[model samples]
Target: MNIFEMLRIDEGLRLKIYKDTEGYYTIGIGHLLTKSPSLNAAKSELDKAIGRNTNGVITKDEAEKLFNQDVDAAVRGILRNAKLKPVYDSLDAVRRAALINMVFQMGETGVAGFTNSLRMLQQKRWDEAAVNLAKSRWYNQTPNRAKRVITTFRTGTWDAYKNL
Candidate 1:
């Protein structure tokens, strides 16, 4: 599956500002604005970034631009991390996309704390990597998304997770 498509499925699109699962203000494919902000602060950033006189809404095209940029940022965030950089390079495209997806949600530094998981990924220990993911707080918090990501890590393919 397309990486963006996979992300879009997991991170649902929003034309207007909304609270994330954590109650953080977010817009456009899980792009975080702040932990707690007034409508004015949130809408101003949206207006400034999308370059429109948006009161509280944006078009799909504008939202998609931020989505693409966030995806790009996630990749760079992974590659810039010393721990994940090598792990990311050693994997195939699909597996790399899995890490990118995780980083997109958790940030690179957060994912880097998965020491055993990252090690398992680099060593090509698919089952161990899957277990490491499945037993984490992240897994429990969002099991379905974690299920797909862990399945992707295990099988190194999209077919297994696409239907999930």
Candidate 2:
């Protein structure tokens, strides 16, 4: 299949900046913007990424291309870390995706600090893992989002609030 098709399957298509699993302002299939770093920083990186010095408007096609490159680099970084490798490789796709999503939101270093949550996941204790996730600062900071992610971790399904 083509790169475009592959990226669509992996990241989905989005045309606007939305808060991602980690509560960061992300756009174009999970491109984390560095616009919110400084204490007074309130800029947007969309224009910069697409080489436009003006507005943040971008096409879906452009987003797909950008995501293709970004996801590859991010995954490479995740895999390169020895501390995150073994457990990452051991889980199934659903669990793995949840963990990767966590890493995407929190960064490998940030997610690494969740020792109890990681331990529960490593043990395949789904319920306990969900509880551990719910107890995190990340969860408290964004409860709705945290609920969805915790639900996914507990149930192994993308439909976090559904029993079906």
Candidate 3:
């Protein structure tokens, strides 16, 4: 499956404005409205993503559009990283999804900090890569998602989300 399905499962589709776990204003599949230059500008983008009048609410298709935008940005962010470029290209779709999702959550620079892990992945040392992943604060803070991604890295399969 594409990373989009996995992210839709992980991030969940939200149609209304709400505070995220970190108290940041977020909407439509974890889009961080709080990071916008202005909440007003963020709302404008929200409605534009919706392409209709919205009272802080969006439709499923609109949310999907916003999510697609987020996913594209994450992919671009990861690809833009010089160190991650070849590594990303050398992996299978399953493993690639893991990296994309990591970049989606943590940003390219944050994932780039996992130098050891990235090296292990590039060398096809899946188990060692997982080891490096499990040792991170990212794992401690978001254990569930981190563990799932780590499983994908270790096994090179989508078994982590098989139950879904």
In terms of lDDT, the best-performing candidate is: 1
Tens digits of per-residue lDDT, candidate 1, 26-75, equal 88888877665687888777778778878677778888999899899999
Q: Report, for every candidate in turn, its global Cα lDDT versus the true structure.
A: 0.87, 0.66, 0.84
Clashing pairs in 1: none
Clashing pairs in 3: none
Candidate order, lDDT descending: 1, 3, 2
Model 3: CA > 4 A from native? 36-53
By the TM-score metric, which is better: model 1 or model 2? Answer: 1
Best by TM-score: 1
Clashes of each: 0, 0, 0
